[PDB]
Amino acid sequence: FKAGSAKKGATLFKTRCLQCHTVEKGGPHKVGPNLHGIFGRHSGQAEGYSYTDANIKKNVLWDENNMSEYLTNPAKYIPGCGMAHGGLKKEKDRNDLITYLKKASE
Amino acid sequence: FKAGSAKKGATLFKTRCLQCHTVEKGGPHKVGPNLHGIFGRHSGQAEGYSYTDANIKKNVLWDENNMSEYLTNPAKYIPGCGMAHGGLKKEKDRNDLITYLKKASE
Numbered sequence: 406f407k408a409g410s411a412k413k414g415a416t417l418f419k420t421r422c423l424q425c426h427t428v429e430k431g432g433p434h435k436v437g438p439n440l441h442g443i444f445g446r447h448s449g450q451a452e453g454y455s456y457t458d459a460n461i462k463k464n465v466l467w468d469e470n471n472m473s474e475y476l477t478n479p480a481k482y483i484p485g486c487g488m489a490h491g492g493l494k495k496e497k498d499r500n501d502l503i504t505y506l507k508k509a510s511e
Numbered sequence: 512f513k514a515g516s517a518k519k520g521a522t523l524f525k526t527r528c529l530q531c532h533t534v535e536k537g538g539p540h541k542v543g544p545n546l547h548g549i550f551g552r553h554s555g556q557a558e559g560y561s562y563t564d565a566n567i568k569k570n571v572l573w574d575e576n577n578m579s580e581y582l583t584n585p586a587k588y589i590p591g592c593g594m595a596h597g598g599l600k601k602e603k604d605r606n607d608l609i610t611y612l613k614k615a616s617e
């Protein structure tokens with residue numbers, strides 16, 4: 406991961422992520438947990454959300470690289486429903502996204 | 512709606528609902544909102560959850576009858592993902608479920 410465009414990352418997040426996740430402090434859970442302070446904690450630890458994926462639940466320490474990898478696969482499992490478009494296949498898109506996400510969060 | 516078996520309703524909820532919803536007080540959100548005090552408020556009002564369905568968001572006053580109807584359709588939309596098994600087709604199953612849910616909640 407190498408910093409990119411926050412501005413474009415914002416538009417990736419609004420159009421690809423926001424329909425399941427919010428990022429502002431104290432923001433609400435949706436199908437996905439609120440992501441505020443995601444880069445200061447581990448996986449599967451948002452207050453007031455209960456997780457499903459075994460790997461998330463192991464509490465991975467989130468960093469840029471781990472997250473890029475998490476977002477690489479275009480499809481993700483949504484509990485009780487099936488697979489959904491939960492990632493960004495283009496490495497540049499990931500870098501943009503994560504650059505925005507680091508700022509919007511914390 | 513006519514009261515049924517709480518015991519069987521519990522097993523319907525554990526096996527058909529729990530994978531997206533919790534019911535205890537202060538319990539966490541998952542893909543679905545925590546359902547505690549659902550029969551004392553309106554639709555689309557759980558603290559700390561943000562909703563998608565337009566109809567939910569209109570804030571329907573929840574009662575037994577409205578809920579039975581909500582659960583009738585076997586498939587429900589899960590935002591960003593698709594349709595999922597979000598209901599109970601058998602009217603007796605609904606009555607059992609709702610009888611448990613009234614108690615577990617509040």
Ligand code: HEM
Nearest residue numbers: 421422425436437448449456457458489490491492591592
């Ligand atoms: C590129 C867009 C997206 C981003 C950046 C994103 C980010 C994340 C992150 C970082 C987590 C981990 C939360 C944690 O460990 O605390 C996560 C979990 C989750 N996200 Fe996303 N997400 C995206 C798209 C989606 C979409 C489209 C959906 C639904 C259709 C979704 C639903 C979920 C769900 C349900 C979880 C919890 C998984 C589980 O408990 O097993 N996300 N998301």
Ligand code: HEM
Nearest residue numbers: 485486527528531542543554555562563564595596597598
């Ligand atoms: C018979 C089993 C189930 C029951 C009793 C149940 C109950 C409910 C209730 C009462 C609501 C309305 C919440 C509110 O207005 O505050 C709701 C919303 C929801 N439930 Fe379920 N549910 C069931 C199964 C499912 C399943 C299987 C899933 C996912 C695969 C699910 C996901 C959701 C979601 C995402 C919402 C929020 C809908 C939106 O915002 O558009 N539920 N559920």
